[PDB]
Amino acid sequence: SGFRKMAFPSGKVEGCMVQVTCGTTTLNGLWLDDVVYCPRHVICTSEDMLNPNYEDLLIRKSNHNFLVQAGNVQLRVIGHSMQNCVLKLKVDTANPKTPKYKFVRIQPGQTFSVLACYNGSPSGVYQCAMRPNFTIKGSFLNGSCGSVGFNIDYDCVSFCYMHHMELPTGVHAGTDLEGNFYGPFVDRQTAQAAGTDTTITVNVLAWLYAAVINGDRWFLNRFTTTLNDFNLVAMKYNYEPLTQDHVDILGPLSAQTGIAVLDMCASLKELLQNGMNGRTILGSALLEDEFTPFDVVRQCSGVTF
Amino acid sequence: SGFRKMAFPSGKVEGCMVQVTCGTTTLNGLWLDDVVYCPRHVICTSEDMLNPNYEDLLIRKSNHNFLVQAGNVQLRVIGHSMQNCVLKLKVDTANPKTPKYKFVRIQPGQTFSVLACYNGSPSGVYQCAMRPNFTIKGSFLNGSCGSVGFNIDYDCVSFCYMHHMELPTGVHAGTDLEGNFYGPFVDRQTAQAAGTDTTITVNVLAWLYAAVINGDRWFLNRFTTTLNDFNLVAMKYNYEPLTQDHVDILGPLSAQTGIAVLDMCASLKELLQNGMNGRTILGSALLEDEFTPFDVVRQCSGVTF
Ligand SMILES: *C(=N)N(Cc1cccc(Cl)c1F)N(C)C(=O)[C@H](Cc1ccccc1)NC(=O)OCc1ccccc1
Ligand SMILES: *C(=N)N(Cc1cccc(Cl)c1F)N(C)C(=O)[C@H](Cc1ccccc1)NC(=O)OCc1ccccc1
């Protein structure tokens, strides 16, 4: 039936993306109700970034310096405040398309859809995971700051990410919609690097279950294992420790496939130790860790919105 | 800056997806203006499929057997015709959300976005390619038939695919929005199989250019090559022949990176002959052929909608 990395439908979010310009910098904003949220470093010049005192820099800001544009319409700014690392630009016009929404701070290992935009016009949509080191592997060019990541939980858009930064290592850092960075990152042009990027073990197992459900089963072994034993091989290969909570989460997948979680851990142990010998699982020559158990069950059932 | 497999924003298409039920079967339809397009095998029972005479089967169809549903609203059927392998269900209500659109029949090797739906509610969005053997590798569960693939060309939604079939080999077959299957496939429950799936050579090179643009450059060699010579190694590995037109298409990528196309072909030759030796390009251990030169330039510039 198939298994692919897919994003949520982005309709509800498209009509929330505006353009924000401050001086010579232009990036994306998120317009919900009468507020436009964007990264506060829109007010810095390439030189301010080396050591910004955002509060002082913000004193020098008139609403007139903030030119917000919804496609072609231009919006009115009747105030501007700062919440952590995001600017809250109050406007008079409530977005007639504001969806039911929450702001959620997601956990490392969880996934969201990113709607990439350039100058307030959506460009594409793709799925990301919040790595254990609080980075994401996305596609953000110049003009992409302000793009948001989100999940559609039932009838509600849960905003969880706004793009701010590219690390000189080529990965991406950002904040929740309250302006708190994920990870130890600061919006200053200084030496910062991502910590060791470990692999999300619970997700790899959900992917191996997704593979079993889709006929790929050459990795299923007769061996079995215990949590403690498996977590030794995991630590060796910079894999995340597998807790009992993680096994409980894989319950429904174990039930559907008829393969105890610890039996799947036995298969993963051998793949880490011996490799794929040139076979592929669901089309990859590598172990995939950016599907949650919930991404899998969702795709192997048929949940809609 | 990043390179990811991303779909077009699906907002314009979401509000075009309805639910169609005929008897015991329910699948998705596409409602543009006053017409609902869906796969004609919605009228067959699991038994009719072994040898359907769709024209006769359609005689026995009253509009009353066709229950169309837009989310919760129910639509009126004032006629029903058949164009090749798609039913055109005329309704009285024009979709107030019909976007500017064309119906395009895409070429093998080109990509489109699929909006997967289950019972007329969109589930997710992902990018596919039309393989050289006129199949696609997607994610279509029960209830997914009728989901469409599309490209957003400027201001126009170009519909190019509607899902009909899963081959017993696990790949997917479907039609253009005029009801003509891609490939030699028929909507009958009989022995049919996909031909040899060759690799889209022009796309792999666009991906290797995308990789160079993103700092991955360990594959760039001093060797060079000619078209004829390279196409010998390609044929060997079930790769598509590279024409001069394909080299002209890679022009803009060659220009941006400063690497003649034939020099990139020299790199691909060595990767096919020797393998990756455990390195990765843009995060894959395998050569990716589902990005067109246009998908790449689009992501390495910043084209929006
Ligand atoms: C957002 N509009 N955007 C522009 C952008 C996009 C892709 C790559 C780069 Cl290099 C780029 F500038 N971003 C990511 C930025 O404007 C940020 C702003 C910033 C700068 C410094 C610290 C925090 C935020 N630019 C950025 O991340 O540049 C890379 C960088 C990061 C840290 C230290 C030096 C350089
Ligand atoms: C669409 N609603 N859908 C249901 C569906 C989804 C995933 C897997 C399967 Cl097996 C499945 F049935 N499809 C793909 C179908 O309804 C088609 C209808 C059909 C049947 C036979 C020939 C053409 C079209 N089912 C299908 O492709 O089943 C697989 C198959 C194909 C060919 C021969 C035998 C079986």
XYZ file of C-alpha atoms and ligand atoms in Angstrom:
680
model
C 0.000 0.000 0.000
C 3.060 2.174 0.457
C 4.977 4.175 3.048
C 6.298 7.661 2.298
C 7.494 10.680 4.275
C 4.500 12.993 3.969
C 3.489 16.337 5.417
C 0.117 17.466 6.649
C -2.040 19.370 4.158
C -0.870 22.964 4.434
C -4.034 24.781 3.354
C -4.891 25.994 6.842
C -1.368 27.406 7.227
C -0.854 28.915 3.769
C -3.369 31.702 4.382
C -1.472 32.599 7.554
C 1.882 33.459 5.933
C 2.744 37.122 5.367
C 5.827 39.105 4.338
C 7.744 41.206 6.861
C 10.406 43.749 5.918
C 12.520 45.811 8.305
C 15.016 48.077 6.586
C 16.943 45.931 4.123
C 15.823 42.550 5.521
C 12.692 40.710 4.383
C 11.416 37.437 5.832
C 8.182 35.610 6.648
C 5.659 36.209 9.398
C 2.740 34.255 10.827
C -0.532 36.197 11.058
C -3.036 34.692 13.506
C -5.985 36.801 14.672
C -4.597 40.383 14.843
C -0.939 39.479 15.531
C 1.987 38.848 13.172
C 4.688 36.648 14.715
C 8.182 36.722 13.212
C 11.823 36.261 14.273
C 13.084 39.267 16.211
C 16.380 39.327 14.320
C 14.459 40.935 11.449
C 15.348 44.251 13.128
C 19.107 43.594 13.153
C 21.469 44.547 10.369
C 24.045 41.975 9.275
C 26.379 43.908 11.614
C 24.042 44.218 14.606
C 23.964 40.414 14.766
C 27.523 40.088 16.092
C 26.240 41.335 19.466
C 22.590 42.467 19.454
C 20.971 44.139 22.452
C 17.511 43.482 21.063
C 15.681 45.550 23.685
C 17.655 48.690 22.813
C 17.540 47.911 19.082
C 13.765 47.600 19.460
C 13.461 51.031 21.103
C 14.677 52.529 17.823
C 11.831 50.833 15.918
C 8.774 52.708 14.724
C 5.868 50.710 13.340
C 6.774 52.553 10.132
C 9.954 50.461 9.913
C 7.771 47.306 9.929
C 6.176 46.775 6.508
C 3.899 43.724 6.610
C 2.350 42.375 3.412
C -0.291 39.656 2.979
C 0.403 38.598 -0.594
C -0.360 42.001 -2.102
C -2.547 43.624 0.576
C -0.577 45.644 3.146
C -1.398 45.406 6.849
C -1.496 48.095 9.540
C 0.823 47.941 12.562
C -0.676 49.370 15.764
C 2.021 48.180 18.160
C 5.097 45.993 18.375
C 6.373 43.972 21.341
C 8.941 41.231 21.935
C 8.305 37.825 23.509
C 11.659 36.102 23.981
C 13.078 35.763 20.450
C 9.879 36.555 18.486
C 8.281 39.904 17.693
C 4.522 40.208 18.217
C 3.414 42.824 15.666
C -0.157 43.803 16.516
C -2.276 44.691 13.487
C -5.808 46.039 13.181
C -7.022 43.409 10.700
C -7.760 40.006 12.189
C -6.896 37.285 9.707
C -10.281 36.141 8.313
C -8.558 32.763 7.807
C -7.188 32.229 11.320
C -7.652 28.491 11.988
C -8.282 26.950 15.360
C -4.758 26.692 16.714
C -2.471 26.060 19.670
C 1.192 26.829 20.293
C 2.957 23.621 21.351
C 6.599 23.105 22.268
C 7.405 19.677 20.840
C 9.767 17.120 22.362
C 13.007 15.839 20.816
C 12.185 12.927 18.549
C 8.805 14.268 17.426
C 7.973 15.303 13.880
C 6.226 18.261 12.284
C 5.447 19.616 8.829
C 7.371 22.658 7.601
C 5.779 25.059 5.123
C 8.790 26.705 3.503
C 8.150 30.267 2.338
C 10.139 33.006 0.610
C 8.886 36.576 1.093
C 5.559 35.523 2.578
C 4.562 33.171 -0.254
C 4.577 29.424 0.526
C 7.088 27.444 -1.540
C 6.606 23.838 -0.445
C 5.851 21.510 2.430
C 7.975 18.737 3.923
C 8.274 16.699 7.116
C 11.012 17.255 9.701
C 11.967 15.785 13.054
C 13.270 17.611 16.119
C 16.627 15.878 16.447
C 17.839 14.882 19.926
C 20.305 17.795 19.650
C 17.408 20.245 19.090
C 18.225 20.862 15.424
C 16.258 19.953 12.310
C 17.408 18.918 8.828
C 15.343 21.093 6.506
C 15.524 23.297 3.400
C 15.758 26.996 4.311
C 17.300 29.447 1.837
C 17.565 33.228 2.132
C 14.115 34.662 2.751
C 13.061 31.480 4.555
C 13.306 32.714 8.150
C 9.864 32.925 9.703
C 8.656 29.711 8.077
C 6.798 27.591 10.629
C 6.560 23.908 11.445
C 3.248 22.484 12.559
C 1.130 19.418 13.242
C -2.608 19.094 12.591
C -4.026 17.483 15.749
C -7.663 16.713 14.895
C -9.243 20.113 14.130
C -6.428 22.258 15.545
C -3.207 23.503 13.974
C -0.459 23.032 16.574
C 2.353 25.439 15.719
C 5.634 24.196 17.158
C 8.523 25.754 15.215
C 9.612 28.995 13.582
C 12.873 29.026 11.633
C 15.599 31.452 12.728
C 19.040 30.034 12.127
C 21.326 27.926 10.019
C 24.234 26.477 11.934
C 27.575 26.709 10.080
C 27.299 22.885 10.156
C 24.345 23.038 7.745
C 21.504 22.155 10.134
C 18.690 24.441 11.281
C 17.685 25.960 14.613
C 14.567 27.811 15.663
C 12.033 28.567 18.352
C 8.572 27.645 19.458
C 5.867 30.208 18.769
C 6.561 31.728 22.201
C 10.086 32.633 21.109
C 12.132 30.131 23.117
C 14.821 28.434 21.065
C 14.929 24.679 20.887
C 18.311 23.711 22.282
C 21.059 25.974 23.575
C 20.984 28.324 20.611
C 21.006 32.120 20.663
C 20.089 34.538 17.876
C 23.564 36.078 17.779
C 26.259 35.696 15.115
C 28.699 33.781 17.297
C 30.386 30.389 17.517
C 27.678 27.855 18.363
C 27.483 24.241 17.227
C 25.030 21.381 17.498
C 25.833 18.703 20.034
C 26.244 15.068 19.096
C 23.288 14.058 16.920
C 22.094 10.707 18.243
C 19.595 8.469 16.458
C 15.975 8.254 17.631
C 15.757 4.546 18.455
C 11.995 4.391 19.063
C 11.424 5.900 15.611
C 13.753 3.467 13.825
C 11.716 0.630 15.319
C 8.450 2.216 14.182
C 10.015 2.433 10.716
C 11.013 -1.240 10.865
C 7.413 -2.010 11.825
C 6.192 0.136 8.927
C 8.519 -1.962 6.767
C 7.116 -5.271 8.024
C 3.609 -3.966 7.346
C 4.746 -3.245 3.760
C 6.214 -6.664 2.993
C 9.880 -5.886 3.718
C 10.756 -8.612 6.224
C 14.272 -9.898 5.438
C 15.537 -8.307 8.675
C 13.297 -10.304 11.033
C 15.558 -12.696 12.953
C 15.115 -15.629 15.308
C 17.236 -13.879 17.949
C 15.603 -11.964 20.808
C 17.006 -9.615 23.439
C 16.468 -7.701 26.679
C 16.237 -3.933 27.086
C 19.517 -3.658 29.008
C 21.398 -5.809 26.485
C 20.035 -3.950 23.459
C 20.785 -0.546 25.006
C 24.467 -1.533 25.151
C 24.599 -1.946 21.369
C 22.578 1.269 21.029
C 24.920 3.411 23.134
C 27.773 2.019 21.035
C 26.274 3.435 17.817
C 25.079 6.798 19.217
C 21.506 5.542 19.371
C 19.069 6.921 21.922
C 18.464 4.700 24.970
C 15.249 2.717 24.616
C 13.076 3.098 27.709
C 10.111 0.982 28.759
C 7.877 3.926 27.865
C 9.201 3.593 24.311
C 8.185 -0.079 24.346
C 4.698 0.842 25.570
C 4.454 3.359 22.706
C 5.298 0.618 20.198
C 2.491 -1.493 21.668
C -0.062 -0.918 18.903
C 2.564 -1.596 16.230
C 3.663 -4.806 17.963
C 0.012 -5.866 18.123
C -0.671 -5.163 14.447
C 2.368 -7.071 13.157
C 2.527 -9.853 15.747
C 6.176 -9.122 16.584
C 7.098 -8.315 20.183
C 9.006 -5.061 20.523
C 12.055 -6.789 21.989
C 12.030 -9.122 18.977
C 12.231 -6.081 16.706
C 15.081 -4.784 18.874
C 16.851 -8.067 18.146
C 16.563 -7.301 14.429
C 17.847 -3.741 14.880
C 20.793 -5.063 16.907
C 21.932 -7.207 13.971
C 21.452 -4.392 11.453
C 23.643 -2.112 13.575
C 26.296 -4.816 14.025
C 26.410 -6.292 10.511
C 24.774 -3.712 8.235
C 22.368 -4.193 5.362
C 24.806 -6.079 3.075
C 23.365 -4.082 0.188
C 19.673 -4.734 0.775
C 17.157 -1.952 1.391
C 14.261 -1.396 3.790
C 11.337 0.531 2.284
C 13.796 1.781 -0.335
C 16.515 3.113 1.984
C 20.055 1.814 2.376
C 20.102 3.549 5.783
C 18.083 3.331 8.982
C 15.420 6.050 9.128
C 14.619 7.744 12.438
C 12.299 10.620 11.431
C 9.032 8.662 11.627
C 7.317 8.480 14.997
C 5.153 5.511 15.979
C 2.275 7.926 15.428
C 3.385 8.909 11.928
C 3.420 5.192 11.102
C 0.079 4.167 12.617
C -1.423 7.254 10.975
C -0.202 6.194 7.527
C -0.975 2.486 8.073
C -4.624 3.212 8.974
C -6.062 6.302 7.274
C -6.438 9.302 9.589
C -7.656 12.477 7.871
C -8.511 16.090 8.766
C 20.776 25.897 3.176
C 19.318 22.440 2.716
C 17.773 20.140 0.124
C 14.659 18.091 0.878
C 11.967 16.272 -1.096
C 9.059 18.693 -0.775
C 5.572 18.956 -2.213
C 3.734 22.005 -3.433
C 1.414 23.692 -0.930
C -1.841 21.770 -1.202
C -4.298 24.461 -0.108
C -5.679 25.042 -3.591
C -6.294 21.298 -3.983
C -7.645 20.460 -0.523
C -10.913 22.311 -1.122
C -11.386 20.272 -4.298
C -11.492 16.808 -2.684
C -14.879 15.170 -2.113
C -16.143 11.727 -1.088
C -17.784 9.405 -3.611
C -19.686 6.252 -2.670
C -21.246 3.746 -5.058
C -22.912 0.814 -3.342
C -20.390 -0.606 -0.889
C -17.338 1.224 -2.292
C -16.218 4.677 -1.149
C -13.305 6.637 -2.602
C -12.226 10.192 -3.412
C -13.367 12.531 -6.154
C -12.098 15.809 -7.580
C -14.704 18.582 -7.796
C -13.786 21.358 -10.241
C -16.488 23.782 -11.393
C -19.684 21.649 -11.559
C -18.009 18.276 -12.261
C -16.751 15.552 -9.911
C -14.021 13.396 -11.467
C -13.330 9.966 -9.974
C -12.093 6.514 -11.046
C -14.759 4.636 -12.981
C -14.096 1.400 -11.100
C -16.075 2.921 -8.220
C -19.123 1.337 -9.894
C -17.665 -2.191 -9.931
C -18.075 -4.709 -7.151
C -15.001 -6.668 -6.070
C -16.388 -9.361 -8.412
C -17.207 -7.139 -11.397
C -13.512 -6.238 -11.565
C -12.424 -9.637 -12.903
C -13.930 -8.648 -16.270
C -15.828 -5.331 -16.244
C -17.820 -4.106 -19.234
C -17.926 -0.590 -17.837
C -20.349 0.753 -20.448
C -22.983 -1.857 -19.575
C -22.237 -1.585 -15.845
C -22.754 2.169 -16.213
C -26.174 1.724 -17.848
C -27.363 0.204 -14.567
C -26.320 3.346 -12.658
C -28.810 5.920 -11.451
C -27.488 9.188 -10.063
C -29.081 7.895 -6.853
C -26.347 5.245 -6.649
C -23.741 8.061 -6.665
C -23.559 9.726 -3.241
C -21.077 12.611 -3.343
C -20.086 14.409 -0.144
C -18.005 17.576 0.290
C -16.810 17.120 3.858
C -20.294 17.123 5.377
C -22.362 18.911 2.709
C -23.912 16.555 0.138
C -23.869 17.417 -3.563
C -26.523 16.935 -6.247
C -25.878 14.712 -9.277
C -27.607 15.872 -12.471
C -25.867 13.503 -14.878
C -23.065 10.976 -15.107
C -20.824 10.176 -18.081
C -17.592 8.266 -18.688
C -14.410 9.631 -20.268
C -12.002 6.732 -20.755
C -11.352 5.412 -17.228
C -12.814 8.358 -15.253
C -16.428 9.189 -14.448
C -17.543 12.794 -14.961
C -20.329 13.301 -12.400
C -22.063 16.576 -13.238
C -23.381 18.445 -10.200
C -25.463 21.599 -9.881
C -23.153 23.349 -7.403
C -19.995 24.812 -8.898
C -17.145 24.554 -6.424
C -16.759 28.104 -5.023
C -13.085 27.154 -4.530
C -12.277 25.941 -8.048
C -8.731 27.207 -8.724
C -7.373 28.164 -12.097
C -6.360 24.784 -13.461
C -5.255 22.695 -16.426
C -5.212 18.954 -17.058
C -1.701 17.931 -18.128
C -0.409 14.490 -19.057
C 3.116 14.444 -17.639
C 6.121 12.697 -19.174
C 8.080 9.810 -17.640
C 10.751 11.239 -15.378
C 8.711 14.244 -14.242
C 7.530 14.823 -10.691
C 4.268 15.882 -9.083
C 2.786 16.341 -5.623
C 0.238 13.799 -4.393
C -2.445 14.826 -1.905
C -3.393 11.526 -0.290
C -7.005 11.374 0.885
C -9.242 8.834 2.614
C -13.000 9.283 2.143
C -12.699 12.762 0.664
C -10.612 14.240 3.494
C -6.953 15.041 2.705
C -4.469 13.015 4.759
C -1.057 14.271 3.657
C 1.043 15.521 0.779
C 4.208 14.053 -0.726
C 6.252 14.211 -3.925
C 6.296 11.423 -6.517
C 7.929 10.818 -9.876
C 6.421 9.157 -12.940
C 8.841 6.257 -13.281
C 10.066 5.299 -16.767
C 7.759 2.258 -16.491
C 4.740 4.552 -15.917
C 4.326 3.613 -12.252
C 4.795 5.723 -9.134
C 6.065 4.817 -5.658
C 3.500 6.355 -3.325
C 1.397 5.693 -0.214
C -2.165 4.662 -1.118
C -4.216 2.619 1.357
C -7.850 1.541 1.071
C -10.001 4.598 0.465
C -7.129 6.322 -1.344
C -8.291 5.824 -4.937
C -9.249 9.141 -6.478
C -6.368 11.014 -4.857
C -4.710 13.294 -7.409
C -1.169 14.328 -8.232
C -0.502 17.873 -9.340
C 2.029 20.608 -10.023
C 1.535 24.326 -9.363
C 2.791 26.067 -12.520
C 2.755 29.783 -11.658
C -0.904 30.585 -10.880
C -2.391 27.375 -12.298
C -2.903 23.956 -10.734
C -1.853 21.382 -13.343
C -3.590 18.112 -12.490
C -1.669 15.183 -13.942
C -2.556 12.020 -12.004
C -5.478 10.250 -10.366
C -4.795 7.055 -8.427
C -6.574 3.870 -9.524
C -4.441 0.817 -8.936
C -1.881 -0.961 -6.840
C 0.160 -3.481 -8.766
C 0.664 -6.796 -6.921
C 4.337 -5.697 -7.005
C 3.552 -2.852 -4.586
C 3.791 0.119 -6.968
C 0.945 2.372 -8.102
C -0.765 3.031 -11.428
C -3.253 5.675 -12.465
C -4.549 7.990 -15.144
C -4.404 11.572 -16.243
C -7.491 13.654 -15.539
C -8.834 12.654 -18.970
C -8.949 9.014 -17.886
C -6.067 7.565 -19.906
C -3.821 5.303 -17.865
C -0.131 6.014 -17.697
C 1.543 2.926 -19.103
C -0.073 -0.245 -20.399
C -2.375 -0.689 -17.429
C -6.074 -1.535 -17.473
C -8.626 -1.172 -14.678
C -9.374 -4.898 -14.587
C -8.408 -7.452 -11.932
C -6.016 -9.413 -14.125
C -2.339 -10.323 -14.358
C -0.456 -7.126 -15.202
C 3.032 -6.155 -14.074
C 5.291 -3.138 -14.344
C 8.072 -3.335 -16.889
C 11.712 -2.948 -15.960
C 12.062 0.151 -13.778
C 15.071 2.047 -15.105
C 16.718 4.969 -13.318
C 16.138 8.552 -14.482
C 19.708 9.572 -15.313
C 19.040 13.279 -15.911
C 17.453 13.501 -12.454
C 20.338 11.752 -10.681
C 22.662 14.360 -12.175
C 20.407 17.201 -11.025
C 20.546 15.618 -7.563
C 24.347 15.442 -7.724
C 24.315 19.125 -8.675
C 21.962 19.844 -5.768
C 24.522 18.023 -3.619
C 27.443 20.114 -4.881
C 25.411 23.253 -4.189
C 24.963 21.978 -0.604
C 28.622 21.286 0.150
C 28.656 17.540 -0.584
C 31.501 17.283 -3.099
C 33.522 14.128 -2.326
C 32.234 12.555 -5.563
C 33.690 15.181 -7.919
C 36.511 13.498 -9.851
C 39.270 14.572 -12.212
C 38.015 12.128 -14.854
C 35.783 13.313 -17.705
C 33.787 11.439 -20.334
C 31.792 11.557 -23.568
C 28.063 10.965 -23.965
C 28.501 7.708 -25.896
C 31.017 6.333 -23.384
C 28.915 7.253 -20.350
C 25.751 5.785 -21.891
C 27.513 2.406 -22.048
C 27.956 2.357 -18.269
C 24.380 3.631 -17.914
C 22.792 0.885 -20.022
C 24.776 -1.602 -17.934
C 23.078 -0.455 -14.709
C 19.531 -0.015 -16.097
C 19.981 3.746 -16.244
C 18.098 5.831 -18.785
C 20.126 6.912 -21.836
C 21.365 10.479 -21.477
C 20.512 12.525 -24.563
C 21.931 15.881 -25.609
C 18.574 17.421 -24.702
C 19.197 16.192 -21.153
C 22.561 17.981 -21.193
C 20.901 21.187 -22.405
C 18.399 20.873 -19.535
C 21.265 20.638 -17.036
C 22.712 23.841 -18.502
C 21.605 26.201 -15.728
C 22.844 23.778 -13.065
C 26.211 23.407 -14.808
C 26.453 27.201 -14.960
C 25.629 27.707 -11.281
C 28.155 25.152 -10.004
C 30.897 25.607 -12.601
C 30.974 21.889 -13.447
C 30.376 20.822 -17.046
C 27.613 18.253 -17.385
C 29.958 15.655 -18.864
C 32.239 16.179 -15.856
C 29.320 15.318 -13.579
C 28.667 12.259 -15.752
C 32.258 11.242 -15.037
C 31.458 11.349 -11.317
C 28.261 9.323 -11.764
C 30.185 6.740 -13.802
C 32.534 6.086 -10.874
C 29.689 5.937 -8.349
C 27.934 3.308 -10.472
C 31.147 1.307 -10.936
C 32.623 1.508 -7.425
C 29.756 2.540 -5.139
C 29.712 4.987 -2.260
C 32.089 3.011 0.015
C 29.835 3.977 2.911
C 29.668 7.723 2.334
C 26.404 9.577 1.732
C 25.225 12.288 -0.658
C 22.713 14.720 0.861
C 22.035 12.042 3.476
C 21.318 9.105 1.152
C 23.354 5.933 0.746
C 21.661 5.517 -2.656
C 21.426 7.544 -5.851
C 18.193 9.553 -5.982
C 16.356 9.974 -9.286
C 13.047 11.612 -8.266
C 14.249 15.227 -8.456
C 14.045 16.948 -11.822
C 16.470 19.707 -12.804
C 13.490 21.991 -12.240
C 12.781 20.686 -8.741
C 16.419 21.458 -7.923
C 16.689 24.945 -9.431
C 13.355 25.737 -7.778
C 14.664 24.767 -4.336
C 18.114 26.328 -4.888
C 16.610 29.734 -5.777
C 13.287 30.462 -4.065
C 10.271 30.184 -6.373
C 6.912 30.679 -4.644
C 3.197 30.731 -5.527
C 16.679 33.752 7.336
N 16.063 34.648 6.679
N 17.955 33.299 7.148
C 18.737 33.638 5.947
C 19.701 32.542 5.561
C 19.246 31.372 4.954
C 20.102 30.321 4.673
C 21.448 30.409 4.992
C 21.918 31.564 5.579
Cl 23.599 31.715 5.994
C 21.058 32.607 5.845
F 21.536 33.745 6.377
N 18.739 33.098 8.292
C 19.038 31.681 8.574
C 19.238 34.182 8.953
O 18.923 35.324 8.670
C 20.219 33.904 10.089
C 20.232 35.077 11.081
C 21.152 34.802 12.244
C 22.513 35.054 12.143
C 23.373 34.706 13.172
C 22.884 34.111 14.314
C 21.532 33.872 14.432
C 20.669 34.216 13.405
N 21.551 33.687 9.551
C 22.271 32.608 9.902
O 21.894 31.738 10.657
O 23.474 32.625 9.291
C 24.360 31.506 9.577
C 25.171 31.760 10.814
C 24.722 31.341 12.059
C 25.495 31.538 13.191
C 26.723 32.156 13.096
C 27.177 32.582 11.867
C 26.407 32.386 10.731
C -8.569 2.303 -4.129
N -9.575 2.709 -3.468
N -7.849 1.155 -3.946
C -8.007 0.317 -2.747
C -6.727 -0.388 -2.366
C -5.681 0.309 -1.760
C -4.468 -0.299 -1.484
C -4.263 -1.631 -1.807
C -5.291 -2.340 -2.393
Cl -5.074 -4.012 -2.812
C -6.496 -1.726 -2.654
F -7.504 -2.438 -3.185
N -7.486 0.437 -5.093
C -6.039 0.454 -5.379
C -8.437 -0.284 -5.753
O -9.620 -0.225 -5.467
C -7.957 -1.179 -6.893
C -9.102 -1.443 -7.882
C -8.637 -2.279 -9.048
C -8.587 -3.663 -8.951
C -8.063 -4.424 -9.983
C -7.592 -3.815 -11.125
C -7.652 -2.444 -11.239
C -8.173 -1.678 -10.209
N -7.454 -2.433 -6.359
C -6.245 -2.900 -6.714
O -5.480 -2.342 -7.470
O -5.999 -4.080 -6.107
C -4.715 -4.701 -6.398
C -4.791 -5.545 -7.637
C -4.482 -5.013 -8.882
C -4.510 -5.808 -10.015
C -4.847 -7.141 -9.922
C -5.160 -7.679 -8.693
C -5.133 -6.888 -7.556
